[PDB]
Each structure stands twice: as structure tokens, then as C-alpha cells.
């Protein structure tokens, strides 16, 4: 299907990736930059991300889910189903709006493209409604991550797809602090894209910390995998 071949032709290898947040969330302005390198083939992601304008004023654990899955791993027999490579290079626009129980809410905007050889990922994210002292602007959630599965379905009227989930993330004293993601996804070019049958792909999320930086950063370690069409 020459249609999958494109998709193939660019997610082959290895690929270099880059990716740019501006972000706002009560008036805590922050920036953070992140490279690394995906390989689809394997539905493997090997991120490392810097606050470069000094201290994170959210926890990492938190903007997991807002730094690609145009790496996911889909199955020979899924292949119809990947809307995200089918998009490339053009690329897609993702935009979240992600409901923090019992407090704010992030609005995300990001853009996914080639350009060149690079794999490109421009987001903005507006946080509102913060608890000053609560799970999020008071740092009270540990750094770790849960797997999780998310669902995907066409969103045929806008020629894309929507993705709904929730991610539980650790607190200190025990507890969880759910994060309720709605997402929409929509091709920048004007050319045809694979809509896909009902399926979810398959996250597992690893962080560490880069012992020789002195910098506020994130490493992340991401598998992601496309089932649910058997």
C-alpha cells in the first residue's frame, strides 16, 4: 500500500527528535527544551528534557503526557490504523485540555512535524485554576509514572482523531491525583490520512535523572504499543 510505504520510508530507522515548551500556568512562567531520538520499530522513545529557565514550577510527572505518537509501535496487521505517521511529514496538530481532580487544568497546544530529518514537537500549555498550595504548584507528587492504556477513535467530521484517558499520578503521602485527558488530533496538510478503527495504544513511562546535570530536567524512557484490533 504506497500509503504505508510513506509512512515507512520516514519512521524506518532512528529518528532525532526535538521539543519546545512555552509554558503559563498561573502566571508561572517556564520554558523547557528536550532531545532524543524514537524508534518506532520498537515503539521505543528516548527522551531528555530542560527547564531552561531555572526551577519547573509544576512537577515533571506532570507533563509527561504533553511531551509523539507517531512512534508507537503498530502491529503489521494495525498498520492500516496509524493515523499519526500517515499525517507525516506534514504533521498533525494535538491539543489537550487535561482536568487536574480537585484542582486546575492544563490547555495544550502542540504541533508534530518533520522539519528536515528532525522529529519536531511545538507546544504551548496554559495552566488556570491552580491550588497555590495544592498536589501540582506545591510539588507534592512523586517521580514516577504508571502504565496506561489510551483509546483512540476517528473523529471522521474533522478528518482526525479524538483520545480520551486518565493518568493516576503517585502523591507523597500515598494517595493519587487523577488527571482527566481529552485530546483531539487534526492533519496540518491538506492530503489523506489513514482514519483508524477503534484500537488503544499501550504506554509504559520510565523517569531518571541525568547524574551529571545540574539543570531542572526530566529523562524519559517511553514504549508504546498500538493493540485492541485483533
Not at 512537577?59 to 507517531?70: G, H, K, N, S, Y
Request: some cysteine; hydrophobic content about 35%.
Amino acid at each position: 500500500d504506497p500509503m504505508v510505504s510513506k509512512g515507512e520510508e520516514l519512521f524506518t530507522g532512528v529518528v532525532p527528535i526535538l521539543v519546545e515548551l512555552d509554558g503559563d500556568v498561573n502566571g508561572h512562567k517556564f520554558s523547557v527544551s528536550g532531545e532524543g531520538e524514537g524508534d518506532a520499530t520498537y515503539g521505543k522513545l528516548t527522551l531528555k528534557f530542560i527547564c531552561t529557565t531555572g526551577k519547573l514550577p509544576v512537577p515533571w510527572p506532570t507533563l509527561v503526557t504533553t511531551f509523539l505518537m507517531c512512534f508507537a509501535r503498530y502491529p503489521d496487521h494495525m498498520k492500516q490504523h496509524d493515523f499519526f505517521k500517515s499525517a507525516m511529514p506534514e504533521g498533525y496538530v494535538q491539543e489537550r485540555t487535561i482536568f487536574f481532580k480537585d484542582d486546575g487544568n492544563y490547555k495544550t497546544r502542540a504541533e508534530v512535524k518533520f522539519e528536515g530529518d528532525t522529529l519536531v514537537n511545538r507546544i504551548e500549555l496554559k495552566g488556570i485554576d491552580f491550588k497555590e498550595d495544592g498536589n501540582i504548584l506545591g510539588h507534592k507528587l512523586e517521580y514516577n509514572y504508571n502504565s496506561h492504556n489510551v483509546y483512540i477513535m476517528a473523529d471522521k467530521q474533522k478528518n482526525g482523531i479524538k483520545v480520551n484517558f486518565k493518568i493516576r499520578h503517585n502523591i507523597e503521602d500515598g494517595s493519587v491525583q487523577l488527571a482527566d485527558h481529552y485530546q483531539q488530533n487534526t492533519p496540518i496538510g491538506d492530503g489523506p490520512v489513514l482514519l483508524p478503527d477503534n484500537h488503544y495504544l499501550s504506554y509504559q513511562s520510565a523517569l531518571s535523572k541525568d547524574p551529571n546535570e545540574k539543570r531542572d530536567h526530566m529523562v524519559l524512557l517511553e514504549f508504546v504499543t498500538a493493540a485492541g484490533i485483533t
